[PDB]
C-alpha cells in the first residue's frame, strides 16, 4: 500500500533506542502517503536510511530531531498539509541535530547540511521552525512564501541561523541564489513568485504555464488530469472538489436512491470502500470512531459499518482515552470496576508501574491481582495494550486467555499496539490471540521470557509491514537448557506457554482447552464422541461396549442403545416420577419392561399401576 500511518512521540526518547532505528525501516518502506507524522528522532550516523525515498506526501507534519546524520533521504516529498501541527504553530521543524557540545574529535559527526527536500513545492498550514543546529547551510536563501500556500499565510517562521562552520555557496547553475543544496540538481523551483495575476500556480512565465486551480503540487500540462498532487482530493487522477455522491435524490421528494458512482472519503483520497481496519460511514467517510447514536455493527463481509440504532445503542464499555477517560493514563482501583463483564472494550488498556502500587496521596489502592479476573469475557480491543508492570505471583498473562483480536486503532506513541516490557515472567498464555489489525509488537527487557520466537507471527497481520520486536530478553540457548519448548502435538511447534493447553493450532483433538493425543472412544471410562476434533461426553450413557458405545450426540439416543431403561428415544437408570406439571399429567408411574421400556399406567387413578401393585395416586 502506498498509504501508511505516522507516529506520535514528540521529543520523547524511544523505548528501546538500540533497536528503535529498525522500527522505522519496517514502517516507512515504500510508502508514499503518511497518515500521521513523519517523526525522525535520535538517529546516528550509521543509519542507512535510503528506504525513505518513496515518500511523496505527509498529511500531518514532519519532525526531525536530535539525529547525527549528514544528509537525510527525503527528496521525493512533494507537499505537506498539516492536519495536525506541532505546538499548534509549526509544520516543519528540524531541531537540535548534530551534537550539542558534548565531550566528543569527529570530522562529520552529523547534522543535516542542506535542505535537500528536493520535491517540496507547497505547504498548506502551520509554521516553519529551525533552531539549534550548527551543521546547516543554504537555508537562509529560501523564499518560504512560495512554499507557503497563497490563500493560507499563517506565516510564523523562526529560523535560527547560528552556524558553526563555513558555507561555500550552491551551484551557479541556479538562476539565482535559490537552491536546495550545492549540486546543480538542487535549485529552488518556483510556483508563486514568478507567477502573477490571477494565476496561483505556474510552471513558467507564460499564462499558458499557469496550472489548474485544483492542483496543489504544480502541473505538467495545463489540465486538471495533468498535475502532480492535487489540493482537495485525488479521485483516480481527477482532482475533484468532492467525492462523488453516494445517493441520488428526486430533487422534488429527495427520495433516497443509492448512486453506485460515488466514493467514500479517506484523507486525501476518494476511495470506493474503506481499507482494512477502518469504518464505512453513512456520510461516506473512513474514520476511526463511529459518530454519535451510531453502532459499529458486524458487517456482512467484516468491512464494518457505523449505522443508526433505532433503540438506544448499548452501553459499550469505554476503555482508556474515550469519552470518560480521555486523560487518564493508567488503570486505577476505581475505573477497573467499569470493566465488569465487558467483551469489546472501546479504548486502550495500560499497565503502568503506578497501576499496581497506587498513590495514597491521589488516594488509590495498590491493585489486587485477584481483581484482574474481570477481564475474562474480553473478545476484542479497539484500543492498544500497554503492559509495563505485572504481579510477581503471576508467571503469565493468563488474564487474557479469551482474547481473540486486537484491532489497535489508537496506537501507543501513535505507533504501537502490543507493549510488553520489564516483567521477568516466562511465557504469556494468550491462547485465543490471533490477529493484530495494525501497529507493532514490542517485547524487551524481560528476564525469563522464552517462547516468543515460537509464536507464528505470520498469521497475525494485515499488511506486509508489521513485524515483531524481540530484543534484550531470555536467550534462546538458555530456553533449551530448560529443555522445554512447544509440545509434541503443536502444529509446526507453535505454542504460547508450556504444556498441553498452549498450542496455537492442535494436531489431534480438543478436550476443552487441552489438545490431547486421543479421546475416549474405545479406551476409558468417561467416553466422548468426536465433533470435528472436539471431544464431548454424552448424557452419561454411552454404556461402553467392549468395542462400542451407546448414545452419540449428547442428546442421549444415538450410538447404539440404552444402559438400564428406555424412555424412548432416551434412557434412564431409574424411571422417574415428577410432580411439576405444566400440563396436569405427571410421568405416571411407568412400569419397566423386561427390555427396559418404562411404560405408563392403564387406568387414570384409584385402581392400578403404582408400579408395585399398590397405591400412591392421590384422590
Amino acid at each position, epitope marked *: 500500500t502506498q498509504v501508511c500511518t505516522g507516529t506520535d512521540m514528540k521529543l520523547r526518547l524511544p523505548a528501546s533506542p538500540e533497536t528503535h532505528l529498525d522500527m522505522l525501516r519496517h514502517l516507512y518502506q515504500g510508502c508514499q502517503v503518511v497518515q500521521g507524522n513523519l517523526e525522525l528522532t535520535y538517529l546516528p550516523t550509521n543509519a542507512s536510511l535510503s528506504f525513505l525515498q518513496d515518500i511523496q506526501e505527509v498529511q500531518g507534519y514532519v519532525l526531525i530531531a536530535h539525529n547525527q546524520v549528514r544528509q537525510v533521504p527525503l527528496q521525493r516529498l512533494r507537499i505537506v498539509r498539516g492536519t495536525q501541527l506541532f505546538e499548534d504553530n509549526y509544520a516543519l521543524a528540524v531541531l537540535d541535530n548534530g551534537d550539542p557540545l558534548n565531550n566528543t574529535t569527529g570530522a562529520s559527526p552529523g547534522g543535516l547540511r542542506e535542505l535537500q527536500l528536493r520535491s517540496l513545492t507547497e505547504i498548506l498550514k502551520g509554521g516553519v521552525l529551525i533552531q539549534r543546529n550548527p551543521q546547516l547551510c543554504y537555508q537562509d536563501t529560501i523564499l518560504w512564501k512560495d512554499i507557503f500556500h497563497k490563500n493560507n499565510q499563517l506565516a510564523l517562521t523562526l529560523i535560527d541561523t547560528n552556524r558553526s562552520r563555513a558555507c561555500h555557496p550552491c551551484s551557479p547553475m541556479c538562476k539565482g541564489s535559490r537552491c536546495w543544496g550545492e549540486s546543480s540538481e538542487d535549485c529552488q523551483s518556483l510556483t508563486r513568485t514568478v507567477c502573477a495575476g490571477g494565476c496561483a500556480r505556474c510552471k513558467g512565465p507564460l499564462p499558458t504555464d499557469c496550472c489548474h486551480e485544483q492542483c496543489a503540487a504544480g502541473c505538467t500540462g495545463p489540465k486538471h488530469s495533468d498535475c502532480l498532487a492535487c489540493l482537495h482530493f485525488n479521485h483516480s487522477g481527477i482532482c475533484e472538489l468532492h467525492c462523488p455522491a453516494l445517493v441520488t435524490y428526486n430533487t422534488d421528494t429527495f427520495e433516497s436512491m443509492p448512486n453506485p458512482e460515488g466514493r467514500y*472519503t479517506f484523507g486525501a483520497s476518494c476511495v470506493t470502500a474503506c481499507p482494512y481496519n477502518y469504518l464505512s460511514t453513512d*456520510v461516506g467517510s473512513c*474514520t476511526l470512531v463511529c459518530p454519535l447514536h451510531n453502532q459499529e455493527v458486524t458487517a456482512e463481509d467484516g468491512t464494518q459499518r457505523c449505522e443508526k440504532c433505532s433503540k438506544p445503542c448499548a452501553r459499550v464499555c469505554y476503555g482508556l482515552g474515550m469519552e470518560h477517560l480521555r486523560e487518564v493514563r493508567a488503570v486505577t482501583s476505581a475505573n477497573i470496576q467499569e470493566f465488569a463483564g465487558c467483551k469489546k472494550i472501546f479504548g486502550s488498556l495500560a499497565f503502568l508501574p503506578e497501576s499496581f502500587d497506587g498513590d495514597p496521596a491521589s488516594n488509590t489502592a495498590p491493585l489486587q491481582p485477584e481483581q484482574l479476573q474481570v477481564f475474562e469475557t474480553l473478545e476484542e480491543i479497539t484500543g492498544y495494550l500497554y503492559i509495563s508492570a505485572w504481579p510477581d505471583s503471576l508467571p503469565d498473562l493468563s488474564v487474557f486467555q479469551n482474547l481473540q483480536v486486537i484491532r489497535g486503532r489508537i496506537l501507543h506513541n501513535g505507533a504501537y499496539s502490543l507493549t510488553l516490557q520489564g516483567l521477568g515472567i516466562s511465557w504469556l498464555g494468550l491462547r485465543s490471540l490471533r490477529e493484530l489489525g495494525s501497529g507493532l509488537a514490542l517485547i524487551h527487557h524481560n528476564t525469563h521470557l522464552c517462547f516468543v520466537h515460537t509464536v507464528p507471527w505470520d498469521q497475525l497481520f494485515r499488511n506486509p509491514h508489521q513485524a515483531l520486536l524481540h530484543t534484550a530478553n531470555r536467550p534462546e540457548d538458555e530456553c533449551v537448557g530448560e529443555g522445554l519448548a512447544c509440545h509434541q502435538l503443536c502444529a509446526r511447534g507453535h505454542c504460547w506457554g508450556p504444556g498441553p493447553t498452549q498450542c496455537v493450532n492442535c494436531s489431534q483433538f480438543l478436550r476443552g482447552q487441552e489438545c490431547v493425543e486421543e479421546c475416549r472412544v474405545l479406551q476409558g471410562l468417561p467416553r466422548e464422541y468426536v465433533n470435528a476434533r472436539h471431544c464431548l461426553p454424552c448424557h452419561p450413557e454411552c454404556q461402553p461396549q467392549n468395542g462400542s458405545v451407546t448414545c452419540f450426540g449428547p442428546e442421549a439416543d444415538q450410538c447404539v442403545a440404552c444402559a438400564h431403561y428406555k424412555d424412548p428415544p432416551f434412557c434412564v437408570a431409574r424411571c422417574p416420577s415428577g410432580v411439576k406439571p405444566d400440563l396436569s399429567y405427571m410421568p405416571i408411574w411407568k412400569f419397566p419392561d423386561e427390555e427396559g421400556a418404562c411404560q405408563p399406567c392403564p387406568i387414570n387413578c384409584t385402581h392400578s399401576c403404582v408400579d408395585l401393585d399398590d397405591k400412591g395416586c392421590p384422590a
Partner: antibody
Amino acid sequence: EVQLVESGGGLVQPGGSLRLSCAASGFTFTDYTMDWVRQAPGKGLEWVADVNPNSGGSIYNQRFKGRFTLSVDRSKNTLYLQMNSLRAEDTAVYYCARNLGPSFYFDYWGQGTLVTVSS
Amino acid sequence: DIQMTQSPSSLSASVGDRVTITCKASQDVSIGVAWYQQKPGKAPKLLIYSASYRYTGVPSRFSGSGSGTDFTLTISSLQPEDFATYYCQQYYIYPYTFGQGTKVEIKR
C-alpha cells in the same frame, strides 16, 4: 467540547445577497452534517437546509428551491451560506446546527444571528 | 407540512407538577419524532429523540412517551430552570416541520 461560532449577521436591503460563516470545533468534522434552521421573532422555528462535508450537496427546502447555496470549507471546517432576493420574509435568526442522527434531527445549536432585511 | 398541534400554547404551574403537553400530528409519523427546549434569547437544546428516549444529560424528571400521533411530553416535576418554550418536531416526512411552541410560567 462541541461548540459553534457563527458570523455574518448584518443588515441588507430587500433584494441583495450576503454570506455566512459557521465555525466548528472539537469533533470530527466529516462525520456530522451541519445544517441550518431559522426562527422568526415571536414566532416558530423553521428548518432551512442540509449539507454534507462530502459532496457539498445543498439539500434544502422546496419552498426555498434554488434560492440559497451551500459552500463548505472542510480544510477550515467552516461552511458558507449565501443569500438572495426576498422582501423581509426571511428576517430571522439563523441557527447553525449539526444533524446528530444521520437523518434530519439536531442536538447542538449555535448562538446564531439575524440579518435585517430593510431599505 | 403536517399540523403540529400542541395544547395549550401557554400554562402555569408550581414546583413538582406532572404536566403533560402533547403535540398530536395530523398525519401518522409515529416513529421519527424530535423534542426541544429553547430558552428566551438562547439556543435550543435537544430533549427526546423518537418520542421515547431521553438524551444524555437530559435529567430524570423528563419522560418521552406516546406513539401514533399523540406524543407525550411530560415533566414529572417542575423546576425553575424549566421555564422555557418547548417544541415538538417530526423527522419522518420531508420537508421537516417544527411545532409552534408552548410557554411555561409559574402559577401563583
